[PDB]
């Protein structure tokens, strides 16, 4: 039958979908969510053999273990065990496009398990097997007899095994196909793996049983009264003595309870559902659920007889909340949300796509700690425990059907085809049936990047009909089609329109007001965090706060999908597309997260944390105004710490309790601040600190901060004049300057400072030279590739202009003596093929104090692409342990990504001054720096810098961080100006005009001296 | 695999659905709709064998003919060949409800055909087979190899046989299952049959071919300009030299033509459809299509190469018309429709469910001739030719998906379940793909009596999304759900509410105005024409004309589903439910048509024709005002004929040409009305005659009529002194009266006229006695059954009250002689269980003229159910050839169904005075009669009467007309009053209060005399 090449067959003998069951036979266990003896895990060691096609599988395997099989753990992805390669392709399908067919060489994983079944499970009732995730399709046999088949790699497939098992040992055999017609609906941008990658379990239910239950909560106008409505369905034999009891508990207190026999109200001319009953429980003053305060109740559903014997119980956590769109705004409990979201794939660097509770918890704690309140399941239903953690920890969730056909041409070729409606329908309906009782899900999504086809419209309506409690969104076809209640673009920019034909991405501000438009706008994806990125993040947040109908967005994305590989020496390294021999592949495009695959943060996460703060601040005088962005809670776990420092020197500080209602303000007046000792800039830093631990944070967690400049007393005191004057020695080759223990050498043929000495120690490994390029970031490169150059990418523009190849031509090099110093003046031209790109004019003034003041004035031809940076660089001979500076920090920060950084005095080990992005590039810059100290050296001025053991040339020549090698000494890059890093997207230029170095003429000044 | 017990498998290897194709290889043949050499019929003689279950089919059958098979004609329903019995069940499924399973005993029809295939069809191109209709599911093999499987008995299933055929002789094998999971979606109220019942054909297409085409017509505001847009899709290898030309013809004139290479506009980020192209042709002053003037153009779509070589051509008739709902009104070409519709099942009394062109044309003509302008395909897509005929003759059509699950409990059990969404979706999507180019289809329907489930909502939106040109309707779930653009109830009454829980049927006038309601209302079924019915039809038409938003309805239904059976002598008779041994069955409920199975009309058809007239008239003095209800045409084929008669005697007449614009009025002044010379009532009758023949009627066709009373001159002339005086002979047991050669005898113990003689000839077989009951109509019976009485039905109320058992008790019988007459006075009480139900007091006055004047005064107890009639009856000794009367006629008419009858002098053969309803009952009445003549007798008065060879007793005791036998003499029923017949529905009391005999006291008088 080749059922795996027929979209008309997505399953055979599979049971209906339904919310999470456990068939407790003790009600108290159900109340507390304790393990159920009726729900057993079959996870652990199984037998597995790999074959190249289903045709190669031997018949013997159905009845007997293959001697050649290996023993492996399940769940797992077989690529993670080395049986074949995982493939990283973004848009292009990994298989030839020829629906509904798949390749004849189709990797097949033959899994089997011998396991015991107690006779008690078989004497009465039904025993079913549940496979929570099998990628991408499979057949199942039990004790050699075929049971059924299933597709949709991201929802559970359940089969009744009652008539196939026997007391004692039994053997299951599962043949899993890597590719199937379901693969045409699974083209998400992620590694392509396969296997039994989610839990496998066995569930026993009585013959008369709860087969489905739906929980709804509806409220009065002020949310002070609710009615909990629980519709319960049974399968099995109806009898007048059956009853359903639904009880609701808040902790250990029972809030309400109702009992009824089965028999629903009349629905139509034929009657009602004799096999269903709806219980309605009044709840006064319910404690409401939100991501701010995830209050939960427990609904316990008992099926029992009138005389009181329990048959079984099921149950769920219940969050009383209403979600609705009114007057153009998405409201939660009547108040407008501000979504601080992130897209999150299920990815683990060692386990592939298998998820575990520890990793789930770690992700949610980091998310909450970084001020996220929402997550989008990009792009498929997740492992079931995810929803339970979001309900309990408190995160809003977008639950999304496992439908993506991005590689089709045009993209809606399948979604507008009715023959594909059935298969798509089950991906949407099975998801709603399974997850509709979770309060954390607040919005349903129809899938991702599958264009806009009529199947979408049909499905959108089906959901609207079966569950009116949550909005439906879908971005395909232009983000504002008739299949979405929310305008949900991906990568639309704040102010800049991208008027692509048919599916333009308008500026978000403009989009809201197009003629006739009235829906809320929440980006389904924005701020693509690939590599050194998140440039322009603050521009989205300023817009979200100013426009009511801009209600936020989901950043793309949480974690890099890098996989671990081992080198010849056994040492692990982070790999990306193409590193497994996979081709074609999309190389580093699989790494776009705020965090590395092991959960270590990238520097961008701090930027997100700051912009997503829940407290806003203004300063007038010495009065700090604190405004709360919480909608529901008072600031009952927060105090404000304030500190004033002079040039990094602490002058004073205090603490004040914060007591701010949701949406309210608090005014705090600072104390009189005595006058500072000397000249400099006073800076005020305030932080919101939570003194008590929460379920998601430690005592002392800092949730928000902000700084302002206070008074400045510019320095007017003349410097203590030199007890000595430097001496110049002129030679045909060089100009040398000597001052005590110091010596400076300027090469006359190159016009650069080629050497410096302290005592008898040389300080430089490479001379001090102008630098106008950077090792290109992912955002500078975009989709450009050696074999398919994208001439529009910044990297290509610079390359084509000769920026990386330009040679300095000396125009002038002279020396003069002044009354107290020596003055060296140079001028160089950087040219390429005859064109002068940049002119650098400098003066170096060395005085009796030993200080060398460098003044730089650069001209940049108006018609050359604006350069990545304007600065100097050199390789110092020394390697020191610490980097100390007065400037923005402590983490890496760039012009268009520096809001989270604070101006203060920071000191870190040198290695923290390098950010190990998997794909190496310019990194580690710190901006707004007035003093930098390293080894015996100090530089002062107003510049940006980076310092590390890797030169820019090395970073640009190296594709994987594991291949980098520390160079001799230390590379210092000191910039007067640096271009923004961008990131609205990583496939087109995204650096906004205000962060491009287009001024034509630039000036900067540095003082270099000893420490 | 048992694919026929799995709603997840509705087909295997079936090709996509598409509009009618013929693969012409000459464009002019395509233009002219001539027969195509590439489309062959395989209809004719096939081999067939019946089996009790698919398991019983011998494997030998795949490879070769079974010797036991018979040779039979295809298309056919195997029940009509006598292989098994057809079943008539209305709501209750004919199989146990245990979805998706079917009985193990499942009648299987094995059909096979040996036929030739030309090598030219195989050497290039694709040869497919098309089964237009297979009930209910089937497997297909070709030359012993399995091809595919299909479900949905009402849409074509097609399969590519290219790789299975060989030049020369080939053999097809088709195993047809009577029952399948598809049957759960085919519970329509009609005979349950099976087989290959619609056409089987072979279609040859080139490898590079037109695979689909959609034609749309949009207009400017006054319809003076149109844009024809034709989207064309291809299959095969794309090549830059390919082209599509679409040309539009109006008769022989080429109106427009456009050509383009393939390549549609960009649709989304991935591009557009390289395999499609859209041609747009401008049309100025298009001739618009409507049921009034079905103007059609012809669109020819040619697939060819750039040098002009034709590859193939497809084509369709195009009707320029726009259908839209605006401000609560259904508009066609901007004018609000008034639907004069009827539901029509595909039924032939001899061939079952097989349709032929002659029967379809016969139906179409009679419909048009009877002023119908629309038809609803109750309840499945029809044979393809039906739409061609509607497009060309001009009828608005409601095309309805084959989905009816009436027998489920509750009704939406399957339609609300997502697991049945796929199967249902195909029944809707495939109908749309097939019929969307037909102009006659103006509204899509989601099926019938399947409750309201979310699957309906999903499919309603799918339609609206793919074809915005036609509204979508669906009655299930209360008739005004979110799945319907039109409020379309079935059997909702005009003024009376039927507030059933959950799905009330409101009075239609009230429904329109319920709070918040704004849609138009068109009944999908009304005026159930079962048996002697159509009572109150005029009430619906008065309301549709008074209320703009009441836009008409579809009467239930066109033709009785009776089947022919043959008695011992081979004579045919009409059979209904249970007559084939089918049980359970719903007896006569399958006969609800305006016409009998053979197309002979029932009397109700004339009432429908009159109320659905397109001309309305008013009279004011000598002025007749004619108003046209046509929306688009002028009365260019009509003249008004008028006639004035005095009591039936013609006084004057004339004709005036009609020249009225659509919706306009014309005033016609009648000439001076010379006075009449005699007492009597003058009556004016007018008729609209079409002088010229049309495609649907003959010259002389009468399309409308109306009558009015004009002056009346009451008779004040004293008769004249009688030549003689009757004599009274009194005896112990009788009062006899003699006058000339006539004698009357009144029995003194019974109190009735027991005998009357002309000479020595007795004139009565039974005495003249009062009668208060009638042989019950289907509407009087409803669903009541001897085995399950419905105490609320009229017949049961009458029975229970003793109406049929009450016996006359004499209260008084006296005789007096007057100056010139003898007077007999009598009084009788009718009692039951000691209660007096009725009292009848009469006088018989016999005078010198020989006339007997009868006065009747009756009392009816207030607490007894209102009686069916208040009259007298007798069995006359003689039988005469003709019946002549001055009253309403000529056809049968009842109080609530007499608008179409006209007052005049009529004369018919006695048998025309009996209506042969298959299920016999009271029939043949004529009301408003002032004089009745039969043999030598004459009765004068103001009464209603029926006259025939069958007593009411026999009619009520006989269930099939074929078993009635003429009694001796003639039974005459003369009524002073008769109850209405009702018909709003035939399962609950439906006679309106104003037509019930509830006055308590009634008076009538008659004169019987010799002629
Ligand atoms: Mg499949
Ligand atoms: Mg226990
Ligand atoms: Mg054993
Ligand atoms: Mg994608
Ligand atoms: Mg700030
Ligand atoms: Mg099936
Ligand atoms: Mg029905
Ligand atoms: Mg009339
Ligand atoms: Na906002
Ligand atoms: Na590549
Ligand atoms: Na990516
Ligand atoms: Na606080
Ligand atoms: Na690099
Ligand atoms: Na109307
Ligand atoms: Na019956
Ligand atoms: Na019927
Ligand atoms: Na005329
Ligand atoms: Na009868």
The string of DSSP codes covering B792-841 is: TSHHHHHHHHTTTT-EEEEEEEEEEEETTEEEEEEEEEEEETTEEEEEEE
Domains of chain B in start order, with CATH, are: 1-206 (2.60.120.260), 207-321 (2.60.40.10), 322-612 (3.20.20.80), 613-718 (2.60.40.10), 719-1011 (2.70.98.10)
Q: Which residues in chain B touch residue A477, judged by CB atoms under 8 angstroms apart?
A: 268
Q: What's the distance, Cα to Cα, between the start and end of chain B in Å?
A: 81
Closest CA to A900 of A606, A545, A543, A537: A606
Instruction: Note whether B421 contacts A412, CB cutoff 8 Å.
Output: no
CA distance A871 to B912: 113
Pairing between β-strand B209-219 and β-strand B225-235 as defined by DSSP bridges: antiparallel
Q: Which residues contact A824 (CB under 8 A, 6 or more apart)?
A: A735, A737, A746, A813, A814, A815, A843, A844, A846
Instruction: Note whether A458 contacts B454, CB cutoff 8 Å.
Output: no
Structure tokens at A604: 């961008």
Structure tokens at A118: 């107690």
Instruction: Judge if the upstream peptide bond of residue B622 is cis by omega within 30 degrees of 0.
Output: no
CA distance B908 to B933: 11
Closest CA to A334 of A325, A342, A347, A343: A325
Number of other residues whose CB lies within 10 A of the CB of residue A727: 13
Q: What angle do the packed helices A454-466 and B454-466 form, to 10 degrees?
A: 150
Instruction: Note whether A266 contacts B410, CB cutoff 8 Å.
Output: yes
Instruction: Note whether B410 contacts A476, CB cutoff 8 Å.
Output: no
Helix ranges restricted to H, A314-371: 357-369
Q: Which residues in chain A touch residue B16, judged by CB atoms under 8 angstroms apart?
A: 419
Instruction: Note whether B266 contacts A8, CB cutoff 8 Å.
Output: no
**Residue B196 Cα to chain centre, angstroms:** 26
Strand, coil or helix: A576: coil
Q: Which residues contact A626 (CB under 8 A, 6 or more apart)?
A: A615, A616, A617, A640, A658, A660, A665, A666, A667, A668
Burial class (CB in 10 A: 0-12, 13-18, 19+), B335: middle
Residue holding tokens 């003053």? A285
Ramachandran region of residue B531, left (φ > 0), alpha (ψ -120 to 50) or beta? left
Closest CA in chain B for residue A481: B465
Residue A551 alpha carbon to ligand 5 centre in Å: 22
DSSP structure string for A603-617: THHHHHHHHT-SEEE
Radius of gyration of chain A (CA): 33
Instruction: Note whether B454 contacts A460, CB cutoff 8 Å.
Output: no
Beta strands in B670-741 (DSSP E): 680-690, 701-713, 727-730, 734-739
Closest CA to B979 of B774, B768, B790, B832: B774
Structure tokens at A6: 């027929």
Q: Which residues of B are annotated as a binding site for substrate?
A: 90, 189, 449, 525-528, 592, 987
CA distance A452 to chain B (A): 8
Closest CA to B190 of B389, B368, B402, B10: B402
Kindly list the distances between the CA atom of residue A494 and the CA atoms of A214, A553, A557, A681, in Å, as whole numbers in the listed order. Answer: 40, 12, 18, 34
Strand, coil or helix: B960: coil
Residue A655: nearest ligand to its CA? 12
Which helix (H) or strand (E) segment holds residue A987: the answer is: none
CA distance A336 to A770: 52
Instruction: Judge if the upstream peptide bond of residue B644 is cis by omega within 30 degrees of 0.
Output: no
Instruction: Note whether A8 contacts B10, CB cutoff 8 Å.
Output: yes
β-strand partners of A137: A151, A177
Kindly list the distances between the CA atom of residue A1003 and the CA atoms of A843, A857, A942, A945, A999, in Å, as whole numbers in the listed order. Answer: 12, 5, 11, 16, 10
Q: Which residues contact B807 (CB under 8 A, 6 or more apart)?
A: B830, B831
DSSP B455: H
CA distance A350 to A562: 9
Least CB–CB distance from A461: residue in B12, B429, B458: B458
Residue A408: nearest ligand to its CA? 4
β-strand partners of A198: none
DSSP structure string for A402-425: S-B-TTSSSTTTTTT-GGGHHHHH
DSSP B390: I
Pair B571, B334: CB distance under 8 Å: no
Q: Which residues of B are annotated as a binding site for Na(+)?
A: 189, 589, 592
Number of other residues whose CB lies within 10 A of the CB of residue B751: 24
CA distance A617 to B809: 105
What angle is formed at CA B276 by the lines to CA B224 and CA B155, rounded to 5 degrees?
85
List the single best residue of B461, B467, B479, B498 to mutate versus A (max A Cβ within 10 A).
B461
List the single best residue of B269, B404, B425, B492 to mutate versus A (max A Cβ within 10 A).
B269
Strand, coil or helix: A851: coil
Strand, coil or helix: B652: strand
CA distance A831 to A840: 12
Which helix (H) or strand (E) segment holds residue B331: the answer is: strand B329-332
Pair A555, A526: CB distance under 8 Å: yes
Closest CA to B213 of B126, B300, B308: B300
CA dihedral sign, ordered A272, A276, A277, A283: negative
Ramachandran region of residue B254, left (φ > 0), alpha (ψ -120 to 50) or beta? beta
What angle is formed at CA A1006 by the lines to CA A1004 and CA A1011, rounded to 5 degrees?
165
Closest CA to B471 of B519, B506, B509: B519
CA distance B685 to B881: 28
Q: Which residues of A are annotated as a binding site for Na(+)?
A: 189, 589, 592
φ, ψ of residue A779 in degrees (nearest 5): -70, -25
Closest CA to B447 of B771, B155, B104, B27: B155
Ramachandran region of residue B44, left (φ > 0), alpha (ψ -120 to 50) or beta? left
Instruction: Note whether B410 contacts A466, CB cutoff 8 Å.
Output: no
Kindly list the distances between the CA atom of residue A266 and the CA atoms of A243, A274, B693, B871, B877, in Å, as whole numbers in the listed order. Answer: 19, 9, 55, 46, 59
Residue A532: nearest ligand to its CA? 13
Which sequence positions of A are flagged as catalytic? 449, 525
φ, ψ of residue A367 in degrees (nearest 5): -60, -55
Pair B747, B763: CB distance under 8 Å: no
Closest CA in chain B for residue A466: B454
Q: Which residues contact A994 (CB under 8 A, 6 or more apart)?
A: none
Least CB–CB distance from A458: residue in B270, B461, B482: B461
Greatest distance between any 2 Cα atoms in chain A: 113
Pair B474, B488: CB distance under 8 Å: yes
Residue B773 alpha carbon to ligand 5 centre in Å: 98
Q: Which residues in chain B touch residue A460, judged by CB atoms under 8 angstroms apart?
A: 461
Pairing between β-strand B550-555 and β-strand B339-343 as defined by DSSP bridges: parallel
CA distance B415 to chain A (A): 12
Closest CA to A139 of A297, A12, A325: A12
As a dihedral over the C-alpha atoms of residue A447, residue A453, residue A459, residue A461, rounded to 10 degrees, the angle is: 120
Instruction: Note whether A459 contacts B458, CB cutoff 8 Å.
Output: yes
Helices (H) and strands (E) in chain A, counts: 13, 58
Strand, coil or helix: A799: helix
Number of other residues whose CB lies within 10 A of the CB of residue B420: 24
Burial class (CB in 10 A: 0-12, 13-18, 19+), A390: buried
Q: Which residues in chain B touch residue A449, judged by CB atoms under 8 angstroms apart?
A: 269
Query: Which approach determined this entry?
Result: X-ray
Is residue B449 among the annotated active site residues? yes
Structure tokens at A896: 């268009």
φ, ψ of residue B463 in degrees (nearest 5): -60, -50
What angle is formed at CA A289 by the lines to CA A284 and CA A290, rounded to 5 degrees?
145
β-strand partners of A622: none
CA distance A158 to A147: 11
Instruction: Note whether B458 contacts A454, CB cutoff 8 Å.
Output: no
Least CB–CB distance from A268: residue in B412, B454, B464: B412
As a dihedral over the C-alpha atoms of residue B801, residue B805, residue B811, residue B816, rounded to 10 degrees, the angle is: 120
Beta strands in B2-131 (DSSP E): 11-12, 39-41, 44-51, 70-74, 87-89, 108-117, 126-131
Pair B372, B608: CB distance under 8 Å: yes
Structure tokens at A581: 């021999």
CA distance B119 to A755: 92
CA distance A915 to A531: 10
Residue B409 alpha carbon to ligand 11 centre in Å: 50
Pair B876, B969: CB distance under 8 Å: yes
Instruction: Note whether A422 contacts B422, CB cutoff 8 Å.
Output: yes
CA distance B945 to B156: 52
Pair A319, A294: CB distance under 8 Å: yes
Helix ranges restricted to H, B589-712: 604-611
Structure tokens at A996: 């491009």
Residue A689 alpha carbon to ligand 12 centre in Å: 9
Strand, coil or helix: B317: strand
Residue A190 alpha carbon to ligand 11 centre in Å: 7
As a dihedral over the C-alpha atoms of residue B739, residue B741, residue B746, residue B752, rounded to 10 degrees, the angle is: -110
Q: Which residues in chain A touch residue B446, judged by CB atoms under 8 angstroms apart?
A: none
- By the CB criterion, residues less than 5 angstroms from ion ligand 1 are A 3, 6, 9, 181
Closest CA to B1001 of B982, B977, B980: B977
Residue A171: nearest ligand to its CA? 3
Closest CA to A588 of A524, A528, A526: A528
CA distance A425 to A430: 8
Q: Which residues contact B131 (CB under 8 A, 6 or more apart)?
A: B138, B140, B150, B156, B157, B158, B174, B196, B198, B200
Residue B987: nearest ligand to its CA? 16
DSSP B57: S
Which helix (H) or strand (E) segment holds residue A121: the answer is: helix A119-123
Radius of gyration of chain B (CA): 33
Helices (H) and strands (E) in chain B, counts: 13, 58
Residue holding tokens 């160079």? A967
β-strand partners of B788: B785
Pair B562, B575: CB distance under 8 Å: yes
Q: What angle do the packed helices A537-546 and A604-611 form, to 10 degrees?
A: 10
Q: Which residues in chain B touch residue A503, judged by CB atoms under 8 angstroms apart?
A: 268-269
**Residue A490 Cα to chain centre, angstroms:** 14
CA distance A150 to chain B (A): 12
Residue B590 alpha carbon to ligand 15 centre in Å: 12
Closest CA in chain B for residue A13: B6
Pair B892, B924: CB distance under 8 Å: yes
CA distance A392 to A892: 34
φ, ψ of residue A644 in degrees (nearest 5): -120, 130
DSSP B393: I
**Residue B32 Cα to chain centre, angstroms:** 33
Per-residue burial over B859-891, b if 16 or more Cβ lie within 10 Å, else e, is ebeeebbbbbbbbbbbbbbbebeebebbbbbbb
Per-residue burial over A106-136, b if 16 or more Cβ lie within 10 Å, else e, is bbbbbbbbeeebeeebbeebbbbbbbbbbbb
Kindly list the distances between the CA atom of residue B185 and the CA atoms of B180, B182, B415, B756, in Å, as whole numbers in the listed order. Answer: 10, 5, 9, 64
Burial class (CB in 10 A: 0-12, 13-18, 19+), A863: exposed
Which helix (H) or strand (E) segment holds residue B780: the answer is: helix B778-781
DSSP B81: G
Catalytic residue among B449, B475, B638, B796: B449
DSSP structure string for A703-716: EEEEEEEEEEE---
Pairing between β-strand A926-934 and β-strand A882-889 as defined by DSSP bridges: antiparallel
CA distance A238 to chain B (A): 15
Strand, coil or helix: B605: helix
The resolution, in angstroms to one decimal, equals 1.7
CA distance B1003 to B857: 4
Strand, coil or helix: A986: coil
Pair B589, B91: CB distance under 8 Å: no
Q: Which residues in chain B touch residue A415, judged by CB atoms under 8 angstroms apart?
A: none
Q: Which residues contact B601 (CB under 8 A, 6 or more apart)?
A: B366, B594, B595
Which helix (H) or strand (E) segment holds residue A316: the answer is: strand A310-318
Structure tokens at B870: 């208040």
Q: What's the distance, Cα to Cα, between the start and end of chain A in Å?
A: 80
CA distance B237 to B772: 81
β-strand partners of A681: A712
DSSP structure string for A504-542: -B--HHHHHTSTT----EEEEEES---SS--TTHHHHHH
Structure tokens at B206: 């080139």
Residue B341 alpha carbon to ligand 17 centre in Å: 25
Strand, coil or helix: A553: strand
Residue holding tokens 């010797």? B67
**Residue A358 Cα to chain centre, angstroms:** 18
Instruction: Note whether B412 contacts A465, CB cutoff 8 Å.
Output: no
List the single best residue of A3, A92, A270 to mutate versus B (max B Cβ within 10 A).
A270
Pairing between β-strand A339-343 and β-strand A550-555 as defined by DSSP bridges: parallel
Q: Which residues contact A792 (CB under 8 A, 6 or more apart)?
A: A782, A988, A989
Instruction: Note whether A425 contacts B421, CB cutoff 8 Å.
Output: yes
């Amino acid at each position: 039958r080749r059922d795996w090449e027929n979209p008309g067959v997505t399953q055979l003998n599979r049971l209906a979908a339904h919310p999470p069951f456990a068939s407790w036979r003790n009600s108290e266990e159900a109340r507390t969510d304790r393990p159920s003896q009726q729900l057993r895990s079959l996870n652990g060691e199984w037998r597995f053999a790999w074959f190249p096609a289903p045709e190669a599988v031997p018949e013997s395997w159905l009845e007997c273990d293959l001697p050649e099989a290996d023993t492996v753990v399940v769940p797992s992805n077989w690529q993670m065990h080395g049986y074949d390669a995982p493939i990283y392709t973004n848009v292009t399908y990994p298989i030839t496009v020829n629906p509904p067919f798949v390749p004849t060489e189709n990797p097949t994983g033959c899994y089997s398990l011998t396991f015991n079944v107690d006779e008690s499970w078989l004497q009465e009732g039904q025993t079913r097997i549940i496979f929570d995730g099998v990628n991408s399709a499979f057949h199942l046999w039990c004790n050699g007899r075929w049971v059924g088949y299933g597709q949709d790699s991201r929802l559970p497939s359940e089969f009744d095994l009652s008539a196939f098992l026997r007391a004692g040992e039994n053997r299951l055999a599962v043949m899993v196909l890597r590719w199937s017609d379901g693969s045409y609906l699974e083209d998400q941008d992620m590694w392509r793996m396969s296997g039994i990658f989610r839990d496998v379990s066995l569930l026993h239910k009585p013959t008369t049983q709860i087969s489905d239950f739906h929980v709804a909560t509806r409220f009065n106008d002020d949310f002070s009264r609710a009615v909990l409505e629980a519709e319960v369905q049974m399968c099995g034999e109806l009898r007048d003595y059956l009853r359903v009891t639904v009880s609701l508990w808040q902790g250990e207190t029972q809030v309400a309870s109702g009992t009824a026999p089965f028999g629903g109200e009349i629905i139509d001319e034929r009657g009602g559902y004799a096999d269903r009953v709806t219980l309605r429980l009044n709840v006064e003053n319910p404690k409401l659920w939100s991501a701010e305060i995830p209050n939960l109740y427990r609904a316990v559903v008992e099926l029992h007889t009138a005389d009181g014997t329990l048959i079984e119980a099921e149950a769920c956590d219940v969050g009383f909340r209403e979600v609705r769109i009114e007057n153009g705004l998405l409201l939660l409990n009547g108040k407008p949300l501000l979504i601080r979201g992130v897209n999150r794939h299920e990815h683990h660097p060692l386990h592939g796509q298998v998820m575990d509770e520890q990793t789930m918890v770690q992700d949610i704690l980091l998310m909450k700690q970084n001020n996220f309140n929402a997550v989008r399941c990009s792009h498929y239903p997740n492992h079931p425990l995810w929803y339970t953690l979001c309900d309990r920890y408190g995160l809003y969730v977008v639950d999304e059907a496992n439908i993506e056909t991005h590689g089709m041409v045009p993209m809606n070729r399948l979604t507008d085809d009715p023959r594909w409606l059935p298969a798509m329908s089950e991906r949407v309906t099975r998801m709603v049936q399974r997850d509709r009782n979770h309060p954390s899900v607040i919005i349903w999504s129809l899938g991702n990047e599958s264009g806009h086809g009529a199947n979408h419209d049909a499905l959108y309506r089906w959901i609207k009909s079966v569950d009116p409690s949550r909005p439906v969104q879908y971005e395909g076809g232009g983000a504002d089609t008739t299949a979405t209640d929310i305008i949900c673009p991906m990568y639309a920019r704040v102010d800049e329109d991208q008027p692509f034909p048919a599916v333009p991405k308008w500026s978000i501000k403009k989009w809201l007001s197009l003629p006739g438009e009235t829906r809320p706008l929440i980006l389904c994806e924005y701020a693509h965090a690939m590599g050194n990125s998140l440039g322009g993040f603050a521009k989205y947040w300023q817009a979200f706060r100013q426009y009511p109908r801009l209600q936020g967005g989901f950043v793309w994305d949480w974690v890099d999908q890098s996989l671990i590989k081992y080198d010849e020496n056994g040492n692990p390294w982070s790999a990306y597309g193409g590193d497994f021999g996979d081709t074609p592949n999309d190389r580093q495009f699989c790494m776009n997260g705020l965090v590395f695959a092991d959960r270590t943060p990238h520097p961008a996460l701090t930027e997100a944390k700051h912009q997503q703060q829940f407290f806003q601040f203004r300063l007038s005088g010495q009065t700090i105004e604190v405004t709360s962005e919480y909608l529901f809670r008072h600031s009952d776990n927060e105090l404000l710490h304030w500190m004033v420092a002079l040039d990094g020197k602490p002058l004073a500080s205090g603490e004040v309790p914060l007591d701010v209602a949701p949406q309210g303000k608090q005014l705090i007046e600072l104390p009189e601040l005595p006058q500072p000792e000397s000249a400099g800039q006073l800076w005020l830093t305030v932080r919101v600190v939570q003194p008590n631990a929460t379920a998601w944070s430690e005592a002392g967690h800092i949730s928000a901060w902000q700084q302002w400049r206070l008074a400045e007393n510019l320095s007017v005191t003349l410097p203590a004049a030199s007890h000595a004057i430097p001496h110049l020695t002129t030679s045909e080759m060089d100009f040398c300057i000597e001052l005590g223990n110091k010596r400076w050498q300027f090469n006359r043929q190159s016009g650069f400072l080629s050497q410096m000495w302290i005592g008898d120690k040389k300080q430089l490994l490479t001379p001090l030279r102008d630098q106008f390029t950077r090792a290109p970031l992912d955002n500078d490169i975009g989709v450009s590739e050696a074999t398919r150059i994208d001439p529009n990418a910044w990297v290509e523009r610079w390359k084509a202009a000769g920026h990386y190849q330009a040679e300095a031509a000396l125009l002038q090099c002279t020396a003069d003596t002044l009354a107290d110093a020596v003055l060296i003046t140079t001028a160089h031209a950087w040219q390429h093929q005859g064109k002068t790109l940049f002119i650098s004019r400098k003066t170096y003034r060395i005085d009796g104090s030993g200080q060398m003041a460098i003044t730089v004035d650069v001209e940049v031809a108006s018609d050359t692409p604006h350069p990545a940076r304007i600065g100097l660089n050199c390789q110092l001979a020394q390697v020191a342990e610490r980097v100390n500076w007065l400037g923005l920090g402590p983490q890496e920060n760039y012009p268009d990504r520096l809001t989270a950084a604070c101006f203060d005095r920071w000191d870190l080990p040198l290695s923290d001054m390098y950010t190990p992005y998997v794909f190496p590039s310019e990194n580690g810059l710190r901006c707004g720096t007035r003093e930098l100290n390293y080894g015996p050296h100090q530089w002062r001025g107003d510049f940006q810098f980076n310092i590390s053991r890797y030169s820019q040339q090395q970073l640009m020549e190296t594709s994987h961080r594991h291949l980098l090698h520390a160079e001799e000494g230390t590379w210092l890059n000191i910039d007067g100006f640096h271009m923004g890093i961008g990131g609205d997207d990583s496939w087109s230029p995204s650096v906004s005009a205000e962060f491009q170095l287009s001024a034509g003429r630039y000036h900067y000044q540095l003082v270099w001296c000893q420490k």
